[PDB]
Amino acid sequence: SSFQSDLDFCSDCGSVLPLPGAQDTVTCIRCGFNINVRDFEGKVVKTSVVFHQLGECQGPVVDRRCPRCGHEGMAYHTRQMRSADEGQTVFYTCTNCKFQEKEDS
Amino acid sequence: MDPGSRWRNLPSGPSLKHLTDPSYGIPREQQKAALQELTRAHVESFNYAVHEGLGLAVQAIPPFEFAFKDERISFTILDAVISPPTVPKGTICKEANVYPAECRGRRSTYRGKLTADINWAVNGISKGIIKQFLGYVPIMVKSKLCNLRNLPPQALIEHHEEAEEMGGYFIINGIEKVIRMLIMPRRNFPIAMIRPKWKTRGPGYTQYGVSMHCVREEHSAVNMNLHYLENGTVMLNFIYRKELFFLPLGFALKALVSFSDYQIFQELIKGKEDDSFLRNSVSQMLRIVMEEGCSTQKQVLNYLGECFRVKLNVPDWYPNEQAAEFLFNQCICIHLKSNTEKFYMLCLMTRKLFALAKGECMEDNPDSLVNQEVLTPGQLFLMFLKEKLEGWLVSIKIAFDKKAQKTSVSMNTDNLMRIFTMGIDLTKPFEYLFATGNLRSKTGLGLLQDSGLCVVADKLNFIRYLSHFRCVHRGADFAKMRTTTVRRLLPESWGFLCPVHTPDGEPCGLMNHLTAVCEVVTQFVYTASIPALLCNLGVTPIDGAPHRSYSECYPVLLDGVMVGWVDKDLAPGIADSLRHFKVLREKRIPPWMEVVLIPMTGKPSLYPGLFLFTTPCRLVRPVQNLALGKEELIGTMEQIFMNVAIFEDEVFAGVTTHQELFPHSLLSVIANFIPFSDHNQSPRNMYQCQMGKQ
Amino acid sequence: ASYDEVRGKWQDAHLGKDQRDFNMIDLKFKEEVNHYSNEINKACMPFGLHRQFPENSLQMMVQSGAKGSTVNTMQISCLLGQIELEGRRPPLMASGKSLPCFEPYEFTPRAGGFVTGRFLTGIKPPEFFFHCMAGREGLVDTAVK
Amino acid sequence: SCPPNFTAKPPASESPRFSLEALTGPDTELWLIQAPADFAPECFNGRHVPLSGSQIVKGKLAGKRHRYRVLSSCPQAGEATLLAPSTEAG
Amino acid sequence: MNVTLGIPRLREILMVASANIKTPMMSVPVLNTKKALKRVKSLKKQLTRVCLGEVLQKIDVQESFCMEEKQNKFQVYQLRFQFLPHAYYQQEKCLRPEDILRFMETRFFKLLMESIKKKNNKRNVNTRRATQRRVQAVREIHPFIDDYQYDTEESLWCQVTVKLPLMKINFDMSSLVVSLAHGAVIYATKGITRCLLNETTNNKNEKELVLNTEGINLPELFKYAEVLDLRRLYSNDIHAIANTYGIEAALRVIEKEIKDVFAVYGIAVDPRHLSLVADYMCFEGVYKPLNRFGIRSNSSPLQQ
Amino acid sequence: LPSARWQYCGQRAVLVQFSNGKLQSPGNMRFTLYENKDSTNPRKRNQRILAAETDRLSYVGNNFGTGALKCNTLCRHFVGILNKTSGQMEVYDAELFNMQPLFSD
Ligand SMILES: [Zn+2]
Ligand SMILES: [Zn+2]
């Protein structure tokens, strides 16, 4: 008339057995049903912590002459940095010498 | 478009013929049914919160039993009503009612008498019933307690009010003050969070955690957290009157149910059965409860009623088994009456935390409107009124404890009752919340902020006045942060909040305004037949076993209550036959239910399930379900899984399942009034929306 | 590779806590759609306007330094171009669809904010919601910090 | 030590047996049919229920030809065990 | 590389004049001689901090139980450490995978067996917080080791079979092992995080390889002189040039560290304004701040 | 395509859950069931208490108390027989019990 619980729980009540210790039988606390410590050989708990399992032309161009190198085409990016009352703001960025100037419209 | 859609009366083009007519200047006998859909969430919420919710919030006040000299005085409020505003008694007058146009011009408050039936009883025998004037509460104009209720537009010009008087506002000392709609977290739902501020809360915590905003019948609100720990152990935090409580998970689940520990083991391992660290951790959490000699439910209840008795402020005569069911009644999952469905909910919060900590489900974005709802003016009225009723009872207790010192004749009461004259009067502590906006509570009412609740409805023009009744304010504490994520436009606000209509300075991104089609769900219905309907479909309930294994089965969560386990090959076919009941109004499926089937992909997507929401105070918007041909109230979380279409040409076969009503539905009322919005730039529109309001 | 396999690879690039291979698919759409943002402006802007400079008043205000730029005129009479949002294309949802109109993980540049319609003729509603994101981004990053 | 082995029940009492069968032989295969909450069981009273897959079986009350759908299953080792009363122990 | 930009760098220079600054760099060009270019590929590698949570793939903890006598009953652990392959880092020291095993065999386990015997040797709470918020050489390390097994064909794993006794509570050895596995392996060169020679940039057509490190150790680079042209060195740290190259070159670093803060943001300031700030802050010989602790040097009480 | 024949007879076939594990070992275990008295109300057809005594422990199972499962009210349970000789799945009525072991007071 024995049941099939997990190894860590009693199989007459459902309460949790404690850990092993100073004896050969681990006992429950509310039914006195004792199980051998030899039955806990197959208690193998695994854990795997994983660290490293696997292992734009800066935007569109516009024909604007660069201040430094004099290249004919700079790449731009717009961004609205003032309030909603006025303006946009255009950030140019050259292809050759990578120079970055801004304008406020 | 469907007849009855509220948008069938949308004009083809502008007319201009309505200002050269003989009808111009004759008041109609029917207010217009399109200007009244803008204060509907303000007025219907107050209607629930002075009639039904007040009777459901004097039942959740427990009986007030305290100790006299070896007797036991017991109070309870049986019923509480609010009268519509009249003149004081003794006034020689002809029309006894008081109308709002008097209270604006005289600069007083439009307020109604609150009074209740208290039931005093000594030593358990019911020995009286006293009708006690508690105070005056403010009445919303055009609600079911205003004296302008259901008047036609000609009888409303006679009482000095405008025709098209939409309501939504309190007259407090002559100044009209609306309660705006704050964003609260999504009620009765696990929200997977990752916050590294939680690592410094206890000894060995982890960032991972699941929160829940719990609300009971629109009148109480409590947040509770879970926390993953590096052991695999789960904790459970909750604040009860500025006292943060720590509580392990086994101490909650053993105190809730009388199940054996093998079933509490089994409920927490349902999907993840081959795992080895998880079974070890859910063994440790129950072993912790086994440590202190707490093997049954009553022993855990005595233990937690002895540890948590001095800060719960229970009386000096309860058994500790009742002073521990007092904390599960008011702090842990208040939205479920059963202690069994609190257990089956803490198991789902715990398993969402396990699948979040292992990195198998992604963080639910707390700032996205997928996981956000709105707070209506019926919630903040009913919550604060409930708390002040309890505070009135506590003030009666303080009146007796002050009458005991410097002792009077002090006889047995027998309806003597000069104490109720000396009780606290909630005229002024209830007026203060409206008059200043400063919430004053020993609880916090489940809200994350203290000020910024009532806003003066200014009326400089009519563009400004509408957009106090469409405002969705994110938070009155996020204005001071250096953040950008809580004030950034996200694509899940399509149809529910307006992209352009927000201010541009410091309240940018916080003060959102609703779109035109969007609407707050305020009608409260009952969910009795829906669990039996689901189990008549393929929902195998919790206690039985599904015919396929778990991890090939979705949880089902009907408005905070765990219901069952749907097989994987049935859950698409259940999410269709619950939209094919909502769009056709069948089998008591409400029209505002969110059938949300988060699918099983096998990748770290959202936590899979079939989540059915029916509660109020959400956001919802109408679309056209193309398969039937009828209007569907898509909610905030359904439309991250639906392929809606804007234009008829963009409707394809098999891919497209819905269609928006009219293609400019994404815009607010005020941002529609901008002519040719699609040709001017976006901060021009965001600046025009605050030109028109000036 | 079929499009479901590539779509599964880009779902796997998404949803991961690396977010490095997902910021590399942005940087390969944002190249291929700016080889179409330039080929439009070479066809419409210099010699394709209705009146050219000096007759054109907008080109006179732009080229003589009065107010404008050669970017605002291209947003008026050619495409608006790619909408970048704090450096990248606009955010996919928690379900991998760009906006409720668009299919989950849709390959087309219209899903990532490539507006390709002007302020002259008109902006359709998705290309408008993306544009409002890019405007609120700048107004928030000014108003807060 | 001293377990209860309870027999204490104030409003209750034992019961006799029923005249059903008591046999589980080589031919009898135990099926555990799980029915909806309002299912009148004479609605299938001569119809073929499937023993594999799924099949839209017909009802009786509304006369609908695919009103119910009987889902067949597999060996689940369902923990419910039948207590069929026997004739050797009355 | 990245630096600190804007006002909290200008305040970091002029207002606090910090000894410990956030993101400090160091820049040395290369001789452009063919012998001294093979060496810089190795020297970029020999200064990067290779950490153990950078070459490790996964930790595989496996707790069991083992009992043979009335006292000999134990908790057998097993820590299988997969290391990431040598092909997946060609930027760090050419750290050939026998070295990340000899690190384990020498000095990981001395940290592990000290963390173990610091933890258990002297969660469950209801406290009501009243506020709001060689295998014979490895076995020689301790007798708790039962077994050691490293990979021989390749060089990728390691299994300590730690055999601990029984306790009351079961502590986590996937929390101690993970927290100890955030630690420097063999050489973190003292005050240098990473090195970046990937700049082949030039100003007047030089093809000048520029190292640009993320940390500051001046005498670490002084011993590489046939490969690094130390005549043209640079730093952010004024306190690491005032104490190595003098105050009269910690004054041609203040000017460049103000100009290269304004010129990130497009602003250009005339050098006659900056050389008045460098010749005021380096007036007393030390690098004083312009704050409440640089007004004590002044003479007028009505200005202080 | 296997098929059968539905034949509903009507008696209750009691079905047992255990709060601690599978049974897996039938032996020397008593089984008695304790219905309610009054048949004028429908409590005679609803109230029932199952007793399953073993020499070690004894198990009590209700239909009304806090601990009774909600799979017999929100769902109906049957038991098939499948007499394959005549080819009929003759089907009875069932009810599911979930027994807790009895310890103390
Ligand atoms: Zn036991
Ligand atoms: Zn250039």
Numbering used by the authors:
A (entry chain I): 11 to 65, 77 to 126
B (entry chain B): 1 to 694
C (entry chain A): 837 to 981
D (entry chain N): 13 to 102
E (entry chain A): 1239 to 1360, 1365 to 1375, 1501 to 1671
F (entry chain M): 6 to 15, 21 to 115
Give the original sentences from the paper that presented this experimental model.
RNA polymerase I (Pol I) is one of three eukaryotic RNA polymerases and is specialized in the transcription of ribosomal RNA (rRNA). rRNA constitutes 80–90% of the total RNA mass in mammalian cells. Pol I transcription is the first step in ribosome biogenesis and thus plays a key role in cellular homeostasis. Our structure confirms that human Pol I consists of 13 subunits with only one subunit forming the Pol I stalk. Here we report cryo-electron microscopy (cryo-EM) structures of human Pol I bound to different nucleic acid scaffolds as well as in complex with initiation factor RRN3 at 2.7 to 3.3 Å resolution.
Additionally, the structure of human Pol I in complex with the initiation factor RRN3 at 3.1 Å resolution reveals stalk flipping upon RRN3 binding. In the Pol I–RRN3 complex, clear cryo-EM density corresponding to RRN3 is visible close to the stalk. Human RRN3 binds Pol I in a position similar to the one observed in yeast. It contacts the stalk and residues 468–542 (dock) of subunit RPA1. In human Pol I, the main interaction site for RRN3 is the RPA43 subunit. The absence of a human subunit equivalent to yeast A14 introduces a hinge in the middle of the stalk-forming subunit. This allows the upper part of the stalk to swing away by ~5 Å upon RRN3 binding, while the bottom part remains anchored to the Pol I core. However, two residues (S199, T200) that have been shown to be a target of inactivating phosphorylation lie at the interface with subunit RPA43 (right). We speculate that phosphorylation at these two positions, adjacent to each other, may function as a phospho-switch and disrupt the interaction between RRN3 and RPA43, for example by changing the charge distribution in the interaction area (right). The structures of Pol I–RRN3 and Pol I OC represent inactive states of human Pol I, with RPA12 being inserted into the funnel, an unfolded bridge helix and trigger loop, and a conserved (yet weakly bound) DNA-mimicking loop.
